[PDB]
């Protein structure tokens, strides 16, 4: 060690004695040796090359060099002192060290820290990190259900997965109190030690008794963050409601993950007693428990790349980038992806191209200089179709596939419940503002089943978000404006739950024109009585009965990363001409008459298709396809 | 009164000697730590000694302490090998007794309060199961006179908290000495300690300053469950009385909301703390949990509610759902193996009675009429509990895996109608309401009843019952019901056959692909409302009929009977 | 259950210029047990 500071580990827990005992010299209560665990992890660091390291999924990870050594090299070239120690790599290497770490985290981890700092500073003498490297051990063997956890895993590193609900304000807590003598101005720092400070009680200089006063804002504080999180268990017993768990983040992990984000969370399961009343210092026999956090895994093999994941530069290998680019250059890329989306359902090519264009999303642009408000860049789809037509299953599939996906169904909702509401947090007791689905879906998708049965007091909420993406809560709690930039995937039944063919489109839909003009795509899911289609659908469904994702998500991620298509002269003139054409056509009543909103719809759909093709310029093909899809969707 | 050293000797000799060594095998298994809980049986103890049994019935808690310590001392001679120390808790107890041996000095005497206590170092738990002679008493009737007495009760569950770690023996460590003191907890609350009575501290005259931690402590699986009188138990006009029950160790996570339970325990008090005296709450400390009375082909279907006549195809489809179509999750998208039936009917054909019988039948069942369960009654809501906004469930989420028998679906509230549409379509319930932001999981199957389009378009079977007056039909039914009043398969056996039938998991054969596609297109032409939902209906009914046959392969007979049922329903 | 209160049971101090009084009592114990007078 050169002398870099040893900043304490608030998230690991309060310190302890570290009592050791001979049976060589293990830690009391544990089958651990500091020397053995330290040396085993030093071996793991120096010699652990992968059996397989897919460069495509693990960019920057080779199959030749020892794995974590080049990680230490990058932690030398840049200044963040954190090392991602995959617990399953440890499981493959040394099962004993897995047992010791995922039974005794707060003591095995500091030894791992010591070893890493020692090896790193041996390798690089003149490298300077702000403090010691810290090991983030994650991807421990997934416990499925918190409700099926036992009281034997207290302080034992677990992992679960779920979506956030709230990330409350920072809360400082003491780490090194500052004291000054009121009489003689003698100063002293007092380190927080094992959960409580030591008030000096005598001046060190003038020996006055209890003249030492605690100066607050000279002290040292690490931060905190209550992060209320809703679990997504993979085990759902017969009637276990959605479990929700409190997460206390600390100095480095605070405000790294927002509400609505979906995360695996690996962290220390920590029981803490409950005070009987807020002022009495008694406690309760019946503890609470809350997971701590040592790591959030953002990546999911079922979902697509997140927003910050797309934003970060070093996300894709050059080979993967070239694979995506040539896959784009292949002419039938759009129809290949529309076929890929939801493989179960049988050849809804038009609807799937539309849903794909939604998922890619239109181009983002700034109108602050123009002062035209904020131009909604998202896309919105209305699957208007007869009941029992797999529209609801499309809703479920896309909701699962997309991150930042929220879900509503008819009048299982309310205006305040979608916007926001003030309620007291029962752990801090302050009146806090909890978000709704329309704020959790801020940069994602809201899937709304039973969209007709969503009585207009609620669709009043949808109006503002669909026109300008702002959601102004004006209430005795707060008078503020929540961002709600949600793409919408609405599902509507016709009146009387069957598409009468006598009634025309608007007459059958029966929704307000000021709402139906907001959805920039409307699909009339109808069933022609093609017996060939019936036979083929039967064979498809029974086929799945008797019975790629990575490239798809990486493709969409690259598109969002560095594809922001712009209009061309050809595309603009075609857009004007096609808008006039559609206006002339739909001027006939019954059908949805065109609007400047529909001009915006055409522009956005063209931008989305250009994003799909990576053209970096909206083309006549794009605008022609947008026109074609709009017509064939509405017809 | 008696001498409890004599009683402990009695039960020690008993546990060693009673029977294959009945209790001996259990004792050696727990000695090796192949079981963590134990259960005394007062029938098995009345096998020899009745006075001890009557005393246990009258002062059960003390004898619980006796039995548990007796087995604790019987432990080590039954121990025969080195156990693998499966828990960090095992590591702690082994380390503790190791250092006690190290600094033993066996001649040296130690105080009456310097020793690792039983409640800490036991690592097993001992409960009971009251005798058959002990009649289960009414929850209302378990009064103050029955405090301390051993008592069994039978009641329905209303709501059950989760498993949070109750403290049993808190462990404190010092700032100077290094010993480890214990605070054995008993009550709902404890004042922490701040000073260490270790004799090194008493010698040093040092500040104790001991700090509690969870590492060396002893937590336990603790739940507080609620229970409710049986509606048959209830007197003429009073509402059903409730009761709080406390669940510990290997009694945890047995009962669940809505499931009938029989709990055997003792009715011990807690401090109440405005009239003088010394008042006290009452909780029943559970010591054996047994769900009972709901959750323990042609002749079979006719056995489904023999008191109803006719509707033979209806009963067959009901049997079919009760077996359940094959649960499928292929390629991520879920094709749930639930079967949804609606019974539209003329006023009065015993459709409500059919729903009630299915409610009494299924291992999970919830019979909800129109407005008794509306809004939160069907959905899930929020309630104060460790006080907290516990989100708990209504009817459907209580019936998360079972059968919701919905009665008079026609006149339900429109929000209830919307929720039921959601659960039939996707077996979830999304909510973004005032204080709730959830997506409940409800894998339920719907049995709607109603009186005469969305119904037709979202279902697997709709059945119109029109009792067209036919003289011979009504004559036979009249004779039948009059005979029923005149004279006034077994349900358990029926449910056992169904329970085994649930788990054969057939997979469709390729030979029937042509047959099923041909039948689908032919039914479509005969229609020309049928669609892919009706395709999935025939296909699910085929899978379920294969399950009823118990063979793992569906055949032509199955699809034939499925089309027979649907034709009968539509016509 | 709050009716009774059993004691606070405890154990020994396993593990762990100015000396401490337990050590000094120990030194007196060793001095008074093991002190030899006379000669072989
Ligand atoms: N075969 C039968 N066996 C038993 N009860 C019958 C039979 N036929 C008619 N009933 C009587 O019909 C009455 C009405 O049934 P109910 O469940 O109310 O039908 P719904 O509620 O659909 O109108 C019941 O009280 C029942 O006793
Ligand atoms: Mg009825
Ligand atoms: Zn001073
Ligand atoms: Zn002490």
UniProtKB/Swiss-Prot annotation, chain A:
Documented EC number(s): 3.6.4.12
Protein name: DNA replication licensing factor MCM4
Binding site residues for ATP 2: 346, 391-392, 493
GO annotation, biological process: DNA replication; DNA strand elongation involved in DNA replication; double-strand break repair via break-induced replication; mitotic DNA replication initiation; regulation of DNA-templated DNA replication initiation
Modified residues (Phosphoserine): 14
Residues of the full protein shown: 107 to 770 of 863
Miscellaneous information on this protein: Early fractionation of eukaryotic MCM proteins yielded a variety of dimeric, trimeric and tetrameric complexes with unclear biological significance. Specifically a MCM467 subcomplex is shown to have in vitro helicase activity which is inhibited by the MCM2 subunit. The MCM2-7 hexamer is the proposed physiological active complex.
Keyword Secreted: no
Implicated disorder: Immunodeficiency 54: An autosomal recessive disorder characterized by severe intra- and extrauterine growth retardation, microcephaly, decreased numbers of natural killer cells, and recurrent viral infections, most often affecting the respiratory tract and leading to respiratory failure. Affected individuals also have adrenal insufficiency requiring corticosteroid replacement therapy and may have an increased susceptibility to cancer.
Catalytic activity: ATP + H2O = ADP + phosphate + H(+)
Residue numbers of N6-acetyllysine PTMs: 95, 325
Subunit structure: Component of the MCM2-7 complex. The complex forms a toroidal hexameric ring with the proposed subunit order MCM2-MCM6-MCM4-MCM7-MCM3-MCM5. Component of the CMG helicase complex, a hexameric ring of related MCM2-7 subunits stabilized by CDC45 and the tetrameric GINS complex. Interacts with MCMBP.
Enzyme class per UniProt: hydrolase
Gene: MCM4
Source organism: Homo sapiens (Human)
Family listed: Belongs to the MCM family.
PTM statement from Swiss-Prot or TrEMBL: Sumoylated; SUMO2 modified in response to stress caused by inhibition of proteasome activity (in vitro).
Covalent link location (Glycyl lysine isopeptide (Lys-Gly) (interchain with G-Cter in SUMO2)): 314
Residue span, MCM domain: 333-542
Curated annotation (Swiss-Prot), chain B:
Keywords: Acetylation, ATP-binding, Cell cycle, Chromosome, DNA replication, DNA-binding, Glycoprotein, Helicase, Hydrolase, Isopeptide bond, Nucleotide-binding, Nucleus, Phosphoprotein, Ubl conjugation
Biological process according to GO: cell population proliferation; cellular response to epidermal growth factor stimulus; cellular response to xenobiotic stimulus; DNA damage response; DNA replication; DNA replication initiation; DNA strand elongation involved in DNA replication; double-strand break repair via break-induced replication
Catalytic activity line of the entry: ATP + H2O = ADP + phosphate + H(+)
MCM domain boundaries: 297-482
Motif annotated as Arginine finger, chain positions: 457-460
SMART domains recorded: AAA, MCM
UniProt binding sites for ATP 1: 309, 348, 350-352, 451
PTM statement from Swiss-Prot or TrEMBL: O-glycosylated (O-GlcNAcylated), in a cell cycle-dependent manner.
Major localization class: nucleus
Residue span of region Interaction with RAD17: 465-499
Molecular functions (GO terms): ATP binding; ATP hydrolysis activity; DNA helicase activity; single-stranded DNA binding
Subcellular location: Nucleus; Chromosome
Cross-link position per record: Glycyl lysine isopeptide (Lys-Gly) (interchain with G-Cter in SUMO2): 13
Residues that coordinate or bind ATP 2: 458, 533
Complexes and interactors: Component of the MCM2-7 complex. The complex forms a toroidal hexameric ring with the proposed subunit order MCM2-MCM6-MCM4-MCM7-MCM3-MCM5. Component of the CMG helicase complex, a hexameric ring of related MCM2-7 subunits stabilized by CDC45 and the tetrameric GINS complex. Interacts with the ATR-ATRIP complex and with RAD17. Interacts with TIPIN. Interacts with MCMBP. Interacts with ANKRD17. Component of the replisome complex composed of at least DONSON, MCM2, MCM7, PCNA and TICRR.
Cited PANTHER family: DNA REPLICATION LICENSING FACTOR MCM FAMILY MEMBER, DNA REPLICATION LICENSING FACTOR MCM7
Protein name, as recorded: DNA replication licensing factor MCM7
Swiss-Prot record, chain C:
Annotated gene: MCM5
Oligomeric form and interacting partners: Component of the MCM2-7 complex. The complex forms a toroidal hexameric ring with the proposed subunit order MCM2-MCM6-MCM4-MCM7-MCM3-MCM5. Component of the CMG helicase complex, a hexameric ring of related MCM2-7 subunits stabilized by CDC45 and the tetrameric GINS complex. Interacts with ANKRD17. Interacts with MCMBP. Interacts with TONSL; the interaction is direct.
Domain of life: Eukaryota
Organism: Homo sapiens (Human)
Modified residues (N-acetylserine): 1
Pathological association: Meier-Gorlin syndrome 8: A form of Meier-Gorlin syndrome, a syndrome characterized by bilateral microtia, aplasia/hypoplasia of the patellae, and severe intrauterine and postnatal growth retardation with short stature and poor weight gain. Additional clinical findings include anomalies of cranial sutures, microcephaly, apparently low-set and simple ears, microstomia, full lips, highly arched or cleft palate, micrognathia, genitourinary tract anomalies, and various skeletal anomalies.
Protein name: DNA replication licensing factor MCM5
Note: Early fractionation of eukaryotic MCM proteins yielded a variety of dimeric, trimeric and tetrameric complexes with unclear biological significance. The MCM2-7 hexamer is the proposed physiological active complex.
Cellular compartments annotated: Nucleus; Chromosome
Cited function: Acts as a component of the MCM2-7 complex (MCM complex) which is the replicative helicase essential for 'once per cell cycle' DNA replication initiation and elongation in eukaryotic cells. Core component of CDC45-MCM-GINS (CMG) helicase, the molecular machine that unwinds template DNA during replication, and around which the replisome is built.
